[PDB]
């Protein structure tokens, strides 16, 4: 009863960071060694756990958040970070326990002329709470004049396309990111490593 990590990492499509996807993983055997012992992930950070011993751990549930962002912002997916991604798109809590895994997907997710279907939130009145998701598209009031729902000089559409193109520099190429959160609740564990 293997956990469906293939469905998440080798997913048919990846979601926009502003609308990041969450899959709940429960009641299965998780083999992380296949994950860590590979060259496929540029980043494999973990907080509160050791990567070598993940197969020794037992959890009540796992949440898999996934999305695409630019490479230069992947460092922002960490406790205590600031920036457009952490502030307006996906915010990790200070006490996060879990792993953030990321890899360049230019070969899968770029198109000549730009993929405009991937978006991120560029403007927001306040920072997101941890694990909060905001999918609203209200016009952002950047100046003193009310916008009344009309796009204009100081009244911005709140989302922005990355426009990933294959000729971008590596720092500006698309990276797919999956954050696995390990839920620790006062209950019996249902997702454990191989016995």
């Amino acid at each position, epitope marked *: 009863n293997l956990c469906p990590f293939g469905e998440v990492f080798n997913a048919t499509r990846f979601a926009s960071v502003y609308a990041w996807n969450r899959k709940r993983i429960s009641n299965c055997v998780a083999d992380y060694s296949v994950l860590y012992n590979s060259a496929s992930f540029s980043t494999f950070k973990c907080y509160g756990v050791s990567p070598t011993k993940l197969n020794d751990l037992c959890f009540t549930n796992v949440y898999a958040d996934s999305f695409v962002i630019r490479g230069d912002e992947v460092r922002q997916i960490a406790p205590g970070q600031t920036g457009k991604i952490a502030d307006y798109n996906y915010k990790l809590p200070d006490d996060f326990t879990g792993c953030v895994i990321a890899w360049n997907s230019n070969n899968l997710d770029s198109k000549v*002329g*730009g993929n*405009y*279907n991937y*978006l991120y939130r*560029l*403007f927001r009145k306040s920072n997101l709470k941890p694990f909060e998701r905001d999918i609203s*598209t209200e016009i952002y009031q*950047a*100046g003193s*004049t009310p916008c009344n729902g009309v*796009e*204009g*000089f*100081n009244c*911005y*559409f709140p*989302l*922005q*396309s*990355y*426009g990933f*193109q294959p*000729t971008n520099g590596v720092g500006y190429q698309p990276y797919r990111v999956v954050v696995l959160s390990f839920e620790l609740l006062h209950a019996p564990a249902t997702v454990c490593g191989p016995k």
Partner: nanobody
Amino acid sequence: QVQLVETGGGFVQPGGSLRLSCAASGVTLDYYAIGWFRQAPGKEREGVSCIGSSDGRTYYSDSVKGRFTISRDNAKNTVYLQMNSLKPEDTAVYYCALTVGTYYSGNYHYTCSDDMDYWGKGTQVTVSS
């Protein structure tokens, strides 16, 4: 790489007219937004105008509405900006900048904010007697 060149700056008498031109080279994005910003002495850089490539929708600032006219070149990727009824406070360094557009719900949206993908060198415009 995308390069932006600004031309047409200089000295203009009060109440005169001018024509600034921004030429973009190496542009490969199918859809993009081109904005004109200005920085005046003693004031922080502020936006002036914004244009979308797909439809040419025109956005003007409150202080410049009705006086400055921005348009696109039909033949080449050059943006023209006609200055009319110039005033002494209009003296500033003007820059032309380009960024990628946004696609959502089958429609194209273009934003010209402080954070821009590319920036040009800019030219000085002085409105004085």
